Design a protein around this ligand. Structure first.
Ligand SMILES: Nc1ncnc2c1ncn2[C@@H]1O[C@H](COP(=O)(O)O)[C@@H](O)[C@H]1O
Length: 133
């Protein structure tokens, strides 16, 4: 949850459930599927939301990552592929990463998030759960 309204991702998040496993994709992979989007526009980044829990007298949420098309979201101005903590860049090999994706953001009610799905052959990062799946 957010005490500051986030930029809305077109897609459901990917949640870490095993500590220690790194968030990664093979180069050319990792852009979630949206109907009608040309592969030339399949470029962007996953952004890590660190989550924080409140203290109890019991006994820790792990991060959840959200996808943003290139030139959108909280890192809209950062260059593709730049080392930034909490940003993981992904792109189809059809995409030119020197230009922002031609994709207006999501919301209001207008559209709900698309459950995150990847094409056959995608190496899925172990230790992460794709929300919606
Ligand atoms: N920065 C964000 N933080 C939390 N939720 C977001 C964010 N951007 C968009 N959303 C939408 O809120 C829902 C949470 O994602 P998920 O719970 O993993 O299914 C998703 O449908 C998101 O796309």
């Amino acid at each position: 949850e957010f005490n500051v309204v986030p930029y809305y991702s077109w897609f459901s998040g990917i949640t870490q459930f095993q500590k220690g496993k790194e968030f990664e994709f093979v180069e050319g992979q990792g852009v979630p599927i949206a109907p009608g989007v040309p592969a030339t526009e399949a470029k962007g980044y996953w952004y890590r939301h660190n989550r924080r829990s409140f203290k109890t007298a019991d006994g820790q949420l792990l991060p959840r990552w959200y996808f943003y098309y290139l030139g959108t979201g909280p890192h809209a101005k950062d260059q593709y592929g730049t080392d930034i903590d909490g940003v993981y860049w992904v792109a189809s090999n059809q995409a030119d990463v020197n230009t922002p994706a031609d994709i207006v953001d999501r919301d209001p009610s207008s559209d709900e998030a698309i459950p995150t799905r990847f094409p056959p052959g995608t190496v899925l990062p172990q230790g992460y759960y794709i929300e919606g799946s």
